[PDB]
Amino acid sequence: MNIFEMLRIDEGLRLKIYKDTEGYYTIGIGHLLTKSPSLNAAKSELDKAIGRNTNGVITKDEAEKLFNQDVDAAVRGMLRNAKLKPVYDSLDAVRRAALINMVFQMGETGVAGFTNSLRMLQQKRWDEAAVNLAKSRWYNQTPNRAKRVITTFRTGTWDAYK
Ligand SMILES: [Cl-]
Ligand SMILES: [Cl-]
Numbered sequence: 001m002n003i004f005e006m007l008r009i010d011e012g013l014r015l016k017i018y019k020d021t022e023g024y025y026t027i028g029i030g031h032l033l034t035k036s037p038s039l040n041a042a043k044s045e046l047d048k049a050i051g052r053n054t055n056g057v058i059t060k061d062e063a064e065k066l067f068n069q070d071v072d073a074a075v076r077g078m079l080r081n082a083k084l085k086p087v088y089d090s091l092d093a094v095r096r097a098a099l100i101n102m103v104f105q106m107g108e109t110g111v112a113g114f115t116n117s118l119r120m121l122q123q124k125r126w127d128e129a130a131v132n133l134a135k136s137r138w139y140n141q142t143p144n145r146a147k148r149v150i151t152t153f154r155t156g157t158w159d160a161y162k
Contacts, residue, residue: 001158003071003097007104009161010145013063017042017056021142027056028063030104031070074104083112087122095121098152105145106138121153130154 011030017039020026025033025042033042033049039056046054050062058066078084078100088099099121103111112118114136120129130150133139139146151160 001161003100004067006097006158006161007071007101008067010101010105010148013060015058015060015063017046027058027066029067029070031063031066070104071100074100074108077108078103081108081112083115083118084108087118090122090124092156094156094158095153098149101149101152102138105142110138126154126156 008029013029014027017025017027017033020030020032024035025039025045027033027046031049033045036042043054043056046056046058049066050058078088084099084103088096091099099111114133117129117132120132130153133150133153134146136146139150148160152158
């Protein structure tokens with residue numbers, strides 16, 4: 001199992017523009033298009049992303065291509081993030097995946113704000129972090145997804161994903 005799979009599980013795959021759990025226009029494998037309330041805006045941002053006149057629908061390959069870009073960008077962002085980098089580097093491979101998941105869902109900034117948890121993760125205080133991580137909006141909004149990631153950080157395994 002790996003990040004792509006892991007994120008393909010949490011995010012799903014949709015070939016037609018849709019609203020995310022927050023109501024934002026999204027497409028593909030959790031590819032946010034816009035925070036705008038306008039579907040035209042989203043159709044536009046879509047076409048710009050694809051390089052074609054899509055009409056709110058893309059192929060799977062297209063989806064996968066956006067997905068690749070997004071994973072790459074997320075990593076790269078993390079690595080350029082002073083609060084993030086260090087934690088990331090301290091982690092083992094599985095847990096790194098858990099962090100990237102979060103980052104993809106929530107944005108580096110979003111994630112860089114879980115200071116306490118971040119710190120606990122860095123100290124490898126798994127149970128503590130898992131509890132800390134759970135005191136969050138994120139957990140309360142998307143409990144299941146959140147629990148998956150939390151287990152992964154706590155256990156260092158893919159269990160939650162099997
Ligand atoms: Cl893009
Ligand atoms: Cl959920």
